[PDB]
Design a protein around this ligand. Structure first.
Ligand SMILES: O=C(O)CCCC[C@@H]1SC[C@@H]2NC(=O)N[C@@H]21
Ligand SMILES: O=C(O)CCCC[C@@H]1SC[C@@H]2NC(=O)N[C@@H]21
Ligand SMILES: O=C(O)CCCC[C@@H]1SC[C@@H]2NC(=O)N[C@@H]21
Ligand SMILES: O=C(O)CCCC[C@H]1SC[C@@H]2NC(=O)N[C@@H]21
Lengths: 117, 117, 117, 117
């Protein structure tokens, strides 16, 4: 279900593997922003969701540093996986950049991503 | 540095190790909500931040499922390590609960936690 | 342009008048939550947006109290208006409920609504 | 108890009057950002809050355009008034800037301000 290759609305690619333990591991490639090639991701998901048609809560983090460049930022996605013919992962994210103390009021962007297979 | 035992304004406890690879691993114990005992966390951080006075960007995730309890929820903290006169982690977070499609509009809480050692 | 009747993805109805002052006034009707009938809204908008084809910044508030009921809550929508053939208002919102101090950590939901005519 | 002159952690100044209907009217002056002098604000508040110790839900908007400047941006504050010894208004905010479609993913900042009398 959650494991596989997903794409959002900006065209970024989320490649993820959901493990026994509730662990998420894989790779993120952004189509936008100060980003090039793939980045490591890690996260967690609820490995025993409610049985009432509820979705599956999950979240993951990407620090946008790889061998090619470093944006000095990290993003976390919070959302849920909804399985089925039209499987989706619906999220909201927070992108925090390293700022000085004086600019910290402006260090965090908020947005929402929708991923489909 | 980031490795260590941190507490937030609620009294929750964040125990982390920062790997040289940009990995964050540890446990989280919440003082509030539908939680008891400790939860695995996993995250990422900028392992080569700027030194221009800027903080260190980081994020992590906790799914609130352990051997004791399952809240069917996942929270992500996005923020930055500030190495001022005091060690501090300022974050904003997103908590998403598993919900049916009907209730998805009301699935996600947002807040802000500050951590000191 | 902004002035008109708008509907979001949940089926809520936003009727507003954009004033010369940069004032937004109207009524809001939610299809979801603890709400019946129309509610008073007020907001503001950039009455002189960039000419580069950027959208128009705006926001508005609704306290969910009227003669029918009082949810002891208030939402604020923050976003931009984009004109043309398929004019749209894309927003993110914050919904804060009155709580005790002990429960302030869970007082605020976050979401996103997209409005069309 | 909401009416009056408030200051936040950044040094911004917030002058409000709460109307009986449940209106919020006033001016806002920002210590930071692409801002100078006063800005009209407007908003709503729960004029009939619970009487169990809960705060009063409120919200307000500021479009950062005035005689002096236009940032092509709007901020909304959502949160609650905690009355008593140290009157507080705890908020979270969304700041949206007019952008083109291409940059829309990065148009919104999120933050939180604490105001005191
Ligand atoms: O009630 C649940 O669903 C478990 C949530 C755990 C508590 C939340 S996570 C964000 C915030 N920071 C904390 O230390 N506790 C709350
Ligand atoms: O339940 C309440 O506290 C009052 C109803 C709030 C409904 C919310 S406001 C954000 C979202 N957009 C809508 O059109 N309805 C919901
Ligand atoms: O720079 C702009 O686009 C306009 C000024 C922005 C000031 C922001 S609004 C949120 C935060 N709280 C404040 O008191 N000031 C900043
Ligand atoms: O700081 C940067 O510019 C690098 C990261 C790129 C931004 C992101 S993360 C949220 C959004 N979703 C997505 O696929 N790309 C952008």
């Amino acid at each position: 279900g959650i494991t596989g290759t997903w794409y959002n609305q900006l065209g970024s690619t989320f490649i993820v593997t959901a493990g026994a333990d509730g662990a998420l591991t894989g790779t993120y490639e952004s189509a936008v922003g100060n980003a090039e090639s793939r980045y490591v991701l890690t996260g967690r998901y609820d490995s025993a969701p409610a049985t009432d048609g509820s979705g599956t809560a999950l979240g993951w983090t990407v620090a946008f540093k790889n061998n090619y460049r470093n944006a000095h930022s990290a993003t976390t996605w919070s959302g849920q996986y909804v399985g089925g013919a039209e499987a989706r992962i619906n999220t909201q994210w927070l992108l925090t950049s390293g700022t000085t103390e004086a600019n910290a009021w402006k260090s965090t962007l908020v947005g929402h991503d929708t991923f489909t297979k």
